[PDB]
Write a protein that binds this DNA or RNA. Structure first.
Ligand SMILES: N[C@@H](Cc1c[nH]c2ccccc12)C(=O)O
Ligand SMILES: [Mg+2]
Ligand SMILES: [Mg+2]
Ligand SMILES: [Mg+2]
Ligand SMILES: [Mg+2]
Ligand SMILES: [Mg+2]
Ligand SMILES: [Mg+2]
Ligand SMILES: [Mg+2]
Ligand SMILES: [Mg+2]
Ligand SMILES: [Mg+2]
Ligand SMILES: [Mg+2]
Ligand SMILES: [Mg+2]
Ligand SMILES: [Mg+2]
Ligand SMILES: [Mg+2]
Ligand SMILES: [Mg+2]
Ligand SMILES: [Mg+2]
Ligand SMILES: [Mg+2]
Lengths: 56, 142, 150, 110, 17, 117
RNA sequence: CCCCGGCGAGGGGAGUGAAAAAGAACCUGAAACCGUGUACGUACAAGCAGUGGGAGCACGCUUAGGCGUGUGACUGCGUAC
RNA sequence: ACGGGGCUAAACCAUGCACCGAAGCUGCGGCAGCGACGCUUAUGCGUUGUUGGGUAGGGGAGCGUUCUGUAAGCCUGCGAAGGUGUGCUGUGAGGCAUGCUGGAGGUAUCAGAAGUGCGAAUGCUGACAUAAGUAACGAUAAAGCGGGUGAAAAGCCCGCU
């Protein structure tokens, strides 16, 4: 099926009232490196919870 | 000169208490609907609610004439196919007596958002007691 | 219009409006509906209406003292500065000079003056008598115009 | 003082880039740079580069300080679309639009 | 292009003869 | 002599779309829709110039009827008594005194009662 | 020439010029269409979305006041071409 | 199977007096058509009577646009046309003045000629929407990891499965 009348720019932005992205709120800092990472993720230089887990 | 218009914030509203024992149902509802709307006031404006607050006591003692007590039927539909329900005047008084006065007055009020705000000013009780003594209602011998 | 006589699409079934030609004047780059041709815009004037208008025009110039009559108007050399100085003395700037027979010196002396036209008595026309501010006739051109005007 | 950076003819629909740009509107730049790092959107890579670019302009050209800057304005405009052909069943052809965008970021300390 | 296949088919088109 | 319609057509369209300010949706943006809306707005405005006279008089009668019954007489008997007393104030002014000067209005009701009685 | 960027695309300065919002996608740069900002309205309310009445709010005015501009709760009538 | 609420009259019959009720009639202000009669017109003024819903269709009077003459005139880099606002003005199509943009043309008056006015034609051309960030991403033979390069590697190169 297909529409009988063209939907308005208001009905189009009401449908999109739920499409908004939500930001990450909790950005944790490592205890030794002191830098930021996602919670429960290793830091970009290979630390996790104070210990160097990955020598890359 | 423009015709005077009542202003929703400045309008003055008073409280009245009515006893409904022995009064005919319809011939009391028309007096309520006049005063809920404010038709008794020189400042009456069609788009402003200028009426008064009214407490109706003894809603279960209201009277009807003829055989209306057994033969007046209230219908409503529940929204589901086949959902046509009915109640006679006698069993509305038994089950919920206030709805009888409220239903009657509601059909005599204007429809739309203003007629719904007028209906909020009517307080119907089945008994002789009310809780609004702090509002100091006046007796309305109507 | 250059093109083909082919029907752009079939008569029925395509869901588009009916077309029969790409040269249709409804289409972009199609023909003009009532295209022009070369035409002749000349009208007829009765001889008596043409001569009657000259007499009305001529008598108005006299009435508005825009007509000036002399018997002496010529220049000794075909020099534009000579005629321009002559006209300065007479207090004329925009002027039609009508002469019995046209001299070559006066014709050549006036070609470069754009406010001055010089004519023979046979070459007057209605529009030029109304256009110029003043008209100067030699009294031998005043003669010939009246026999021409019967 | 206000400083501007643009990315014109960015290759993404404005509706897709607008989702990312609404996240950092009115944020401090240090806060907005961390938000854009942890957003799993392609447009977040585009928006961040314009944000870093506008930050550098503020230092070099205008003598501004990073710690004061804030994302004052950000908006995404539609750009020209490129038109392509996609062939469908039974000999029909469709027109594909490859939409672009213009991304503008304004930072200011005030 | 040509007509849609259901608009050519007699069974679909000719339902009320 | 070819004439181009561009400059005249634009100004004629801009005249209609300025009268369509405040309308919803295409009615303020699109000429085919704004034209029909500006016509119907003029049809209503013509029709509602007659009705403005009917709706205000009907309002004055209701405010006289309300203030008169506060003095013990209905509208239909109040107006009749003013005719027998040869008082010629129109309803626009009576509805004005009812609200703003209730002591003058009482004097009018007594005059109506005296003539009617 | 400098700066961000991938020795990018794109941009911000500097400079030329009367003009660079004349920057090569370059005179003018309308409308549909899409956005950002501000003022008002809008989450108990039923329909050609206006019109007649109309409170409140915001911004200007000018005075011993109510006028202008925007918005429009509520209300009568109103089934496009 | 009263429009509804409600009604034992707020129903029906008879009599009466109020009042509401329309763009009807009256009041006030304005405009025009047609008659009649006259301060006298010189073809307009004054009074009076009356008329003014309109499709097919007939008659009358105009607005605006492009081009020609008037015009080697007039306005214009002290800012033209065009664009975009605001204010005033006419019974209407319209007109006039000005702020901002624009950056070199425009054109009174009175006549002349028209490719002279668009919302519709399943009209023609270009631009841009909607459905909608939705279906789909083309054989159900199938991938996994380590190293390299690189701004970035599921897909590129090497290796082993
Ligand atoms: N229905 C089939 C066969 C088909 C092709 N063309 C048609 C025309 C009419 C009826 C059926 C057909 C298809 O679309 O592939
Ligand atoms: Mg051609
Ligand atoms: Mg001949
Ligand atoms: Mg094929
Ligand atoms: Mg340009
Ligand atoms: Mg609400
Ligand atoms: Mg009456
Ligand atoms: Mg009336
Ligand atoms: Mg008529
Ligand atoms: Mg034409
Ligand atoms: Mg039409
Ligand atoms: Mg489409
Ligand atoms: Mg869907
Ligand atoms: Mg789905
Ligand atoms: Mg899918
Ligand atoms: Mg594949
Ligand atoms: Mg790998």
């Amino acid at each position: 099926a297909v529409q009988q009348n063209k939907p308005t720019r208001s009905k189009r932005g009401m449908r999109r009232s739920h499409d908004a992205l939500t930001a990450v709120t909790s950005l944790s800092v490592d205890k030794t490196s002191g830098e930021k990472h996602l919670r429960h993720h290793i830091t970009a230089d290979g630390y996790y919870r104070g210990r160097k887990v990955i020598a890359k | 000169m423009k015709t005077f218009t009542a202003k929703p914030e400045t309008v003055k509203r008073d409280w009245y208490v009515v006893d409904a024992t022995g009064k005919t149902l319809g011939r009391l509802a028309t007096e309520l609907a006049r005063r809920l709307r404010g038709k008794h006031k020189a400042e009456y404006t069609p788009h402003v609610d200028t009426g008064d607050y009214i407490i109706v006591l003894n809603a279960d003692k209201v009277a009807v004439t003829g055989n209306k007590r057994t033969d007046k039927v209230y219908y409503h539909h529940t929204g589901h196919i086949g959902g046509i329900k009915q109640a006679t005047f006698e069993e509305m008084i038994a089950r919920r007596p206030e709805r009888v006065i409220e239903i009657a007055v509601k059909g005599m009020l204007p429809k739309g958002p203003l007629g719904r705000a007028m209906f909020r000013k009517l307080k119907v009780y089945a008994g002789n007691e009310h809780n609004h003594a702090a509002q100091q209602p006046q007796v309305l011998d109507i | 219009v250059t093109g083909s006589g082919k029907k752009p699409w079939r008569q029925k079934g395509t869901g588009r409006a009916r077309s029969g030609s790409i040269k249709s004047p409804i289409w972009r780059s199609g023909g003009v509906t009532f295209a022009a041709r070369p035409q002749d815009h000349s009208q007829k004037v009765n001889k008596k209406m043409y001569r009657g208008a000259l007499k009305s025009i001529l008598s108005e110039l006299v009435r508005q003292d825009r007509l000036i009559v002399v018997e002496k108007f010529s220049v000794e050399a075909p020099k534009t500065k000579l005629l321009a100085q002559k006209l300065k003395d007479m207090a004329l700037e925009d002027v039609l000079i009508i002469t019995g027979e046209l001299d070559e010196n006066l014709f050549l002396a006036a070609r470069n003056l754009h406010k001055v036209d010089v004519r023979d008595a046979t070459g007057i026309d209605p529009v030029s008598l109304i256009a110029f501010d003043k008209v100067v006739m030699t009294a031998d051109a005043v003669k010939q115009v009246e026999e021409m005007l019967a | 003082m206000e400083t501007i950076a643009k990315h014109r003819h960015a290759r993404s629909s404005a509706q897709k880039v607008r989702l990312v740009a609404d996240l950092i509107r009115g944020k401090k730049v240090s806060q907005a740079l961390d938000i854009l790092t942890y957003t799993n959107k392609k447009a977040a890579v585009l928006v961040k580069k314009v944000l870093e670019s506008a930050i550098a302009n503020a230092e070099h050209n205008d003598g501004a300080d990073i710690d004061d800057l804030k994302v004052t304005k950000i908006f995404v405009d539609e750009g020209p679309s490129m038109k392509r052909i996609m062939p469908r069943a039974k000999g029909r052809a469709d027109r594909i639009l490859k939409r672009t965008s213009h991304i503008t970021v304004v930072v200011s300390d005030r | 292009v040509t007509s849609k296949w259901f608009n050519i088919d007699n069974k679909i088109v000719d339902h009320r003869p | 002599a070819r004439v181009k319609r561009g400059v005249i057509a634009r100004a004629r369209h801009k005249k209609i779309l300025k009268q369509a300010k405040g309308y919803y949706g295409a009615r303020s943006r699109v000429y085919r829709v704004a034209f029909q809306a500006v016509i119907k707005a003029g049809q209503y405005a013509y029709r509602d110039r007659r009705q403005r006279k009917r709706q205000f008089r009907q309002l004055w009668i209701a405010r006289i009827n309300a203030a008169a019954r506060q003095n013990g007489i209905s509208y239909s008997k109040f107006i009749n008594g003013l005719k027998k007393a040869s008082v010629e104030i129109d309803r626009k002014i009576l509805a004005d005194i009812a609200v703003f000067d209730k002591v003058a209005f009482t004097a009018l009701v007594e005059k109506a009662k005296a003539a009617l009685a």
